[PDB]
């Protein structure tokens, strides 16, 4: 009577294991995918910035 | 260089190791001393060409990784037992003895031995037993799911070597490939398609049991790695897996065939009982006889083309199928 | 026996599920964190390039 019932906590063990991982993945994948978009982020805004610095010399220059 | 081997068999001849001074004069001799130093260049560029050898991870089979390491591993033994050898040492001596510290500091650096020979010895214990070879001679789901797991405890055994990472991960898409390979061999070889539906639910069973064997000990080395990359999470940065191993689209395939031959099964049951009049209408047979062309149809794409071309005749198949299925519906 | 095994199992399940939420907090952080960085990395990548045009529109004038 007792016993079957430590079988259904054992099935919870299982479960929640089971959730835990799925839920660990999803969130390690979101994680990493909004890492590559910072990246993305990072080296245009390098670029742009590069961009930025020349133009101004170029305005003194022609100013 | 023929002097030294001429100076060296006479002092073996005479029962003693060979020294610098034994060359007497010719120690201090130009065009014997350029000589050497041309005969360390091309030492440096031979020992060069094959300490920097590198193999692309993502290219091969891993059996062909397993070879190409142990090989590499062997010639570069070769090598340091030759580099130790007494005519290169008194080659090195005599060249120090004439003050030419180029090919002397070269031959210490620029060849990079200690460097792979290091490697080599730290990538030895992961690759000393994989199965991979077993697994590729395996020809039963069974027998496969048992290599998967000798593979991945084979795998375990990264944690005491200094494998990269990154390349451990393009070796499991290599082992991935291969499990493609033998699974597609051994679905071929049984013809699923004209076999009893119930064996065949069970040898897919087997297979999403196999699968579920390699989702379940990758997410073990998965959290290993992680841990690996935590304890030396100052020198490696670089955890991206996007992993996308081969047989995966051949999962889904099979997954896709279950439940099409699932729904097929069921349905076909459903309208044998439903049609029969209460004892037999012309329209009953034609229903019945076109649910069993729109199978000998589908049974017309083969079911294991994973390609576009395969892709594209399922997708036609089943289009063509549904609709014939949609008249009875 | 079975009360030893049984009350162990009910509060290992609250051990494990203390665990998941641990984890769960601190990715869910992580995310949130990450989506702020990317969300400032988008709005210096918008001053930067309302900058650029401009600046780029400024060359074409001046010149």
Known sequence: Q?????????????????????????????????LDQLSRASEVERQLSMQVHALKEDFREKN | HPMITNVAKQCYERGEKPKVTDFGDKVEDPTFLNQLQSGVNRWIREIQKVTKLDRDPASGTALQEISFWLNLERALYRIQEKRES????????????????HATVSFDTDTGLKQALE??????????DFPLNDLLSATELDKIRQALVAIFTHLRKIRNTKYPIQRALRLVEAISRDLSSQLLKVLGTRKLMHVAYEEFEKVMVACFEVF???????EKLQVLLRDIVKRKREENLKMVWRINPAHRKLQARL?????????????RAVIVRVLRPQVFDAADANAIEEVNLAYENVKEVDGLDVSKEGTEAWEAAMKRYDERIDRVE
């Open chain 2, 86 to 101: 007494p005519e290169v040492l008194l080659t090195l001596d005599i060249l120090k003895h004439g003050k030419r510290f």
């Open chain 2, 212 to 218: 579920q064997t390699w989702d379940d000990e990758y």
């Open chain 2, 119 to 128: 490697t080599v010895n730290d990538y030895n214990p992961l690759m000393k």
């Open chain 2, 255 to 267: 997954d896709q065939m279950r439940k099409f031959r699932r729904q097929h099964e069921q349905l």
């Open chain 1, 2 to 34: 007792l016993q079957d019932e430590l079988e259904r906590q054992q099935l919870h063990l299982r479960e929640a294991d089971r959730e835990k991982t799925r839920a660990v993945q999803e969130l390690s994948e979101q994680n990493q995918r909004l």
